[PDB]
Design a protein around this ligand. Structure first.
Ligand SMILES: [Zn+2]
Ligand SMILES: [Zn+2]
Ligand SMILES: [Zn+2]
Ligand SMILES: [Zn+2]
Ligand SMILES: [Zn+2]
Lengths: 98, 134, 48, 44, 98, 48, 49, 64, 252, 48
């Protein structure tokens, strides 16, 4: 019988005691988030701090996907703005950073 | 096919059974720490850091630690809490306390102190976290 | 942009401290980078 | 600062300087006594 | 061997708890004979010369949990159902894959 | 509640954003930081 | 199938060969120096342990 | 470890029937007859006692 | 260095690894803290000689199953001596042996010179000579040895029961307190108390057995025992079980 | 107690500690990009 309305279900349900096992994979052990977290001082890129806040690797496969999408602005954000946004001064005459 | 929440290998569970303890479990995570005097200039030891003892300390509460620098059993812990207060002598003394991860939230189940294979003061802290099916 | 004589090292550039920083381990011990370690030998041999 | 010997289950007071060794049993495994603080469990 | 040097039987529970290595002291009888080109030989035997410690597989014939009844295992805080067959190395249960 | 999006304060949203600022990190939805015209970052949890 | 026995026998054969090789070097040094050697000291228990 | 207080499926009290159940088994009752004698009509309640393994009995063999 | 609040104690934040003004919230430095580093949550002759010394310390320590902490302490003691160079003339094996003795003394688990000599090629005499020289070189000192410092090892090596070890400890401690053994080496006193307690117990050990394990001549034991034997009933604990009564202990 | 000029950790090359600024950039650890030092070689060297 349907629990919401109490109406009988047109189809009869196969029901019975079956031995179930709970696996060690809990969601609380896998959920993680990263938003402006700790970065490596040498690499100036994301790394885990005191949690799993290290971010997701935006690998070659994701870059190729975003290239196919043509989302050059989002591609730039993920590969630059979201990882190591930096600016340097460069000389126009010698092209070297000043 | 009860309302589609079990589609693609998903399962729908009876919340009342879970409330009755169906598949409820306990997760025990054991943290081990030792104090080693390798290098005469450095001497790490278990003791709760104090404002006068350490030149710099965070606003984080160390109240969970006992005078021996170890948390007692039956105390709730989280990522904001310290389970072990360890301080190393500088070449003032620096603090090297052991904090839990933000995901680690439970109650200290047991805390044992011993001398390990190296003969150094050694301790194991078992944290009990109860995992309700969700 | 390129000259044969520039292939010979007559003056060695020293990377900034950020490229080869001094990490802190086992307390306040400033653990120098591998580059700083070799730069120390370079300057020692240079003075010698 | 009371520890319970894991072998003889005897409560003994130990300082920072004296060793972990049990006063009477000599056993070197000590368990911290359960906190006297109040912990509330909702019976859910 | 305790810090003071007092030898004591190591229970596997203690090895796991204290991160010890469950090892058995290995001794060998050695006989030294010396000849000094004077048609004479001196024979000296070093009985039970210590040569090292062999890690012991739990519940093997050389393990302390050998022949112990289930009640005795419980007294030692050991599970009677535990099959053994593994080594405790620095407190870690190490199993040798065939 | 852990992830954030930087919204530019505009007359369209000045009042709505002012509310999220006072709500802060303790109450969701809220905000983590304020970036002034000067480019300086203020953590709302430190001084609300 | 090399079980715990054959596997440890392979190690113990190598470690014991190293132990005896070590005893020779130590004993020979004392013999070369012209003095007898204490067998108890020549053995380095660290090799097998 | 120990017998559930409530039957997971329906909430019937079964936590007070374990020693009663064991007594019936000691009295040579079949597992079905013992469950019937206890009044566990629904198979969901029967599943509780018929399949329970009381490990607390074994855990109490270790010193406190 | 808060730009707006000069002389403000910035607060370190692990959430992003930055320092924030304690009374404004202004974040100073983007993410300069490196939270992971803060909160845990072809060989020179001198180095080769030092390495060789370390290999000897680990070998000698293993012979007597000394814990790794004592080895670490010995290596640090050796390094200081080796670097201080007041014993530069002495052999590294002698220095290592004396450092090992000092480490045991500093750790509160003294090993007799005969025991350290038994595991090292260096004789007791040279270790004793190097021992005092190192103390001067290190400008340090070690706690005086006591009779109870050897009871645990000796009684265990003698396989004596816990009560016999406790009785020997009380007998030796009370004998020292009563000053019944003036000038006698604590090892000699400990061995005599062990002999007395052993002879008074079911597990009876000969002076030779005790002498061989404790490293004391039976004559030295006999003399020390002869001094304490007349006061044995005062030395034995009140709460002790006598297998052989004190009145029936060997007279010699 | 402080870095020395003309040394491997010369303060001109960059910021030495996070709570500091280099004299050449007058900027913090993140603001300072770091700068190069140079070792004049008494004898020219082949570049590997
Ligand atoms: Zn330019
Ligand atoms: Zn005890
Ligand atoms: Zn039911
Ligand atoms: Zn200000
Ligand atoms: Zn700069």
């Amino acid at each position: 019988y349907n629990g919401f309305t109490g109406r009988k279900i047109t189809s009869q349900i196969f029901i019975g005691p079956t031995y179930y096992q709970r696996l060690k994979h809990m969601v609380d052990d896998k959920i993680h988030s990263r938003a402006r977290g700790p970065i490596q001082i040498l690499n100036r890129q994301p790394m885990e701090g005191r949690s799993r806040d290290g971010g997701l690797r935006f690998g070659e496969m994701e870059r190729d996907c975003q290239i196919a999408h043509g989302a050059a602005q989002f591609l730039r954000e993920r590969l630059f703005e979201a990882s190591d946004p930096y600016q340097v001064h460069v000389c126009n005459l010698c092209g070297i950073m000043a | 096919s009860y309302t589609g929440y079990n589609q693609e290998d998903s399962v729908i569970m009876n919340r009342s059974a879970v409330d009755r303890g169906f598949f409820r479990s306990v997760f025990y995570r054991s943290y081990k720490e030792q104090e080693s005097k390798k290098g005469f200039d450095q001497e790490e030891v278990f003791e709760k850091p104090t404002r006068e003892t350490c030149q710099g300390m965070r606003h984080a509460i160390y109240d969970k630690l006992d005078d021996d620098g170890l948390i007692a059993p039956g105390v709730r812990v989280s990522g904001d809490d310290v389970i072990i207060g360890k301080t190393v002598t500088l070449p003032t003394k620096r603090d090297c306390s052991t904090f839990l991860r933000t995901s680690e939230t439970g109650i200290v189940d047991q805390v044992m102190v011993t001398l390990n294979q190296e003969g150094y003061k050694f301790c194991k802290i078992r944290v009990r976290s109860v995992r309700i099916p969700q | 942009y390129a000259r044969p004589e520039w292939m010979i090292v007559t003056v060695l550039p020293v990377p900034p401290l950020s490229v080869r920083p001094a990490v802190v381990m086992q307390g306040s011990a400033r653990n120098q980078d591998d580059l700083t370690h070799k730069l120390a030998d370079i300057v020692k041999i240079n003075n010698q | 600062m009371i520890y319970i010997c894991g072998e003889c289950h005897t409560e003994n007071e130990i300082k920072s300087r004296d060793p972990i060794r049990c006063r009477e049993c000599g056993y070197r495994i000590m368990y911290k006594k359960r906190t006297k603080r109040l912990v509330v469990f909702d019976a859910r | 061997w305790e810090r003071d040097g007092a030898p004591s039987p190591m229970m596997p529970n203690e090895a796991r708890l204290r991160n010890l290595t469950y090892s058995a002291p290995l001794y060998v009888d050695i006989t030294k004979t010396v000849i000094k080109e004077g048609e004479e030989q001196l024979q000296t035997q070093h009985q039970k010369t210590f040569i090292g410690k062999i890690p012991i597989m739990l519940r093997s014939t050389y393990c302390l949990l050998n022949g112990l009844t289930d009640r005795d295992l419980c007294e030692l805080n050991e599970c009677p159902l535990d099959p053994g067959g593994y080594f405790i190395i620095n407190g870690s249960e190490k199993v040798l894959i065939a | 509640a852990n992830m954030t999006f930087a919204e530019i304060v505009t007359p369209f949203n000045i009042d709505r954003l002012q509310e999220l600022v006072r709500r802060g990190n303790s109450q969701y939805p809220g905000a983590k930081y304020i970036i002034r015209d000067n480019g300086d970052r203020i953590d709302l949890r430190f001084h609300p | 199938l090399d079980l715990a026995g054959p596997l440890l026998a392979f190690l113990f054969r190598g470690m014991f060969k190293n132990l005896l090789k070590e005893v020779r070097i130590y004993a020979q040094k004392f013999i070369d120096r012209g003095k007898d050697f204490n067998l108890e000291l020549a053995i380095k228990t660290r090799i097998i342990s | 470890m120990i017998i559930p207080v409530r039957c997971f499926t329906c909430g019937k009290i079964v936590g007070n029937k374990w020693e009663a159940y064991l007594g019936l088994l000691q009295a040579e009752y079949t597992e079905g007859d013992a469950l019937d004698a206890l009044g566990l009509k629904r198979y969901c309640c029967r599943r509780m006692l018929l399949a329970h393994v009381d490990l607390i009995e074994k855990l109490l063999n270790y010193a406190p | 260095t808060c730009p707006n609040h000069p002389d403000a104690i910035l607060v370190e934040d692990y959430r992003a690894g930055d320092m924030i003004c304690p009374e404004c919230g202004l974040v100073v430095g983007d993410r300069v803290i490196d939270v992971g580093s803060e909160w845990r949550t072809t060989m020179s002759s001198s180095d080769r000689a030092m390495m060789n010394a370390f290999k000897e310390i680990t070998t000698m320590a293993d012979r007597i199953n000394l814990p790794r902490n004592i080895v670490d302490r010995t290596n640090n003691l050796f390094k200081q001596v080796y670097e201080q160079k007041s014993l530069k003339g002495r052999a590294n094996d002698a220095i290592a042996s004396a450092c090992l003795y000092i480490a045991c003394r500093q750790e509160g688990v003294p090993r007799t010179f005969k025991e350290i000599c038994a595991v090292s090629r260096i004789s007791k005499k040279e270790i004793g000579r190097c021992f005092k020289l190192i103390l001067k070189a290190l400008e340090t000192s070690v706690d005086l040895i006591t009779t109870g410092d050897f009871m645990s090892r000796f009684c265990s090596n003698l396989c004596l029961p816990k009560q016999v070890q406790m009785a020997a400890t009380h007998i030796a401690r009370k004998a020292v307190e009563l000053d019944l053994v003036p000038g006698r080496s604590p090892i000699s006193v400990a061995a005599a108390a062990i002999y007395m307690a052993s002879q008074a117990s079911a597990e009876k050990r000969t002076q030779k057995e005790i002498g061989d394990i404790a490293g004391v001549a039976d004559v030295t034991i006999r003399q020390s025992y002869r001094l304490i034997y007349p006061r044995a009933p005062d030395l034995f604990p009140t709460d002790f079980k006598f297998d052989t009564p004190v009145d029936k202990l060997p007279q010699l | 107690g402080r870095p020395k000029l003309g040394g491997l950790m010369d303060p001109r090359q960059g910021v030495i500690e996070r709570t500091g600024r280099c004299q050449t950039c007058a900027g913090n650890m993140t603001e300072c990009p770091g700068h190069f030092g140079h070792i004049e070689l008494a004898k020219p060297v082949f570049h590997v």
